[PDB]
Design a protein around this ligand. Structure first.
Ligand SMILES: Nc1nc2c(ncn2[C@@H]2O[C@H](COP(=O)(O)OP(=O)(O)NP(=O)(O)O)[C@@H](O)[C@H]2O)c(=O)[nH]1
Ligand SMILES: [Mg+2]
Ligand SMILES: [Mg+2]
Lengths: 153, 30, 31
């Protein structure tokens, strides 16, 4: 019965759509999934944003309805990790203390340029939880979204 | 990829499903 | 709570935006 409007943000190619598709459809169209979080059936509505910047006023206003934000980087893409502050500031701006989860996606891949502590330093520094995920294997995907719910409430 | 409204007699569940599709559609057409 | 009517498949983006917002309010008010 309780609904959560979640927004997924991050650079081009980090796996925002993959995470959304993995959560909802269990694949590697619907933007809504019924989940059970700690015995309570919850409903997750997901906005899967674009990595490509369009400088759109109205896109910011659709983001504004979001209650929580997964900030996704890819662990083998340093530029995508460097982009993270821009997304956190983008979020705080459109929302005017916004619930957030740093997501390090593609943890299945061997060569990683961003280590766990380097990501977790930034996460503790912002005051937000951090989850490693793989849209490919589903590692930590439910954890990521279920943790964002816990962060909103 | 515009979603169609599922009807004036649509269930509340169906309207929620439609709302989430619209949210993404409207975001995308910018 | 007034259920907003289906916007019509020829609706402008502005009209669909209005309907989207009003639908959320409606779904909130009937929950
Ligand atoms: N190995 C691996 N590949 C992934 C993972 N997640 C996404 N990918 C791959 O990364 C590429 C881009 O993924 P996609 O979900 O489109 O990322 P996006 O952030 O939605 N891109 P955009 O911002 O342009 O819409 C795809 O080839 C996809 O298969 C993952 O967890 N592991
Ligand atoms: Mg995508
Ligand atoms: Mg990023």
């Amino acid at each position: 019965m309780t609904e959560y409007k979640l927004v997924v943000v991050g650079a081009v190619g980090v796996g925002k759509s993959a995470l959304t598709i993995q959560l909802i459809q269990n694949h590697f169209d619907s933007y809504r999934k019924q989940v059970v979080i700690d015995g309570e059936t919850c409903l997750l509505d997901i906005l899967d944003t674009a990595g490509q910047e369009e400088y759109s006023a109205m896109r910011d206003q659709y983001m504004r309805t979001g209650e929580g934000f997964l900030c996704v980087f890819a662990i083998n893409n340093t530029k995508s990790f460097e982009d993270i502050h821009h997304y956190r500031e983008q979020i705080k701006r459109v929302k005017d203390d916004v619930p957030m989860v740093l997501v390090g996606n593609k943890c299945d891949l061997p060569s990683r340029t961003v280590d766990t502590k380097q990501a977790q330093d930034l996460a503790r520094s912002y005051g937000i939880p951090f989850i490693e995920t793989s849209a490919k294997t589903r590692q930590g995907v439910d954890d990521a979204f279920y943790t964002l719910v816990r962060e909103i409430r | 990829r515009r979603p169609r409204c599922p009807g004036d007699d649509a269930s509340i569940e169906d309207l929620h499903e439609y709302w989430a599709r619209l949210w993404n559609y409207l975001y995308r057409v910018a």
